Amino acid sequence: SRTSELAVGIFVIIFGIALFFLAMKVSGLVGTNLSDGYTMKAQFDNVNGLKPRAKVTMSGVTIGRVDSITLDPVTRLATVTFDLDGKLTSFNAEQLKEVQKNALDELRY
C-alpha cells in the first residue's frame, strides 16, 4: 500500500540525483545552449581531425559550437557551417548606440 510505494519514491529520488550529476556536472549540456544562434559558412582547405560539435573561440574565450561540415566537390574546398551567438557574440540594446556613435564618428571624421 503506502509502505512500499513511498519507498519506491526514494529510489526515483536517488536515480533523480544521479542523473542530474551525469547531465549537469559532467556532460556538456550546461555548455550547449545558445540564444538566437545564427549560422555562417566559410571555405577552408585543411580541416584535418577537426570534428563537428567543437567549441569555437574568438578572443581567448569561447562563444559557441561548430554545426556541420561537408565538402563542396565543385571547387574542392571545405565547407564549415557553425552556430554563432546572436547575444554575447553580437551586442545588445546598450551597444546599438555604442556602435552607432562609432560607425558615425569613424566615418565622418
Partner 1 sequence: MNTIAWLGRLVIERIRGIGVAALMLLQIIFSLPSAGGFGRFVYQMHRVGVMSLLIITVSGLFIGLVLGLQGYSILVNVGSESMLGTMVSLTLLRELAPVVAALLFAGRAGSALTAEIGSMKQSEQLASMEMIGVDPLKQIVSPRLWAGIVSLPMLTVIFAAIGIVGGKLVGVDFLGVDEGSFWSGMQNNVQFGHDVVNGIIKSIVFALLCTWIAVFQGYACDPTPEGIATAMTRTVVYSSLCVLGFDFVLTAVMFG
For the CB of residue 31, give the shortest distance to a copy of itself in the complex, in Å.
10
Contact between 61 and partner 1 by CB under 8 A: the answer reads: no
Enumerate binding residues for a copy of itself (CB under 8 A). Answer: 17, 21, 25, 27-29, 38-50, 57-61, 63, 69-71, 73-74, 76-78, 84, 86, 88-91, 95, 98
Residue span 29-58 as binding mask against partner 1, x where in contact by CB under 8 A, dash where not: xxxx------------------xxxx----
Q: Is 82 strand, coil or helix?
A: strand
Considering beta carbons, is residue 51 or 76 the nearer one to partner 1? 51
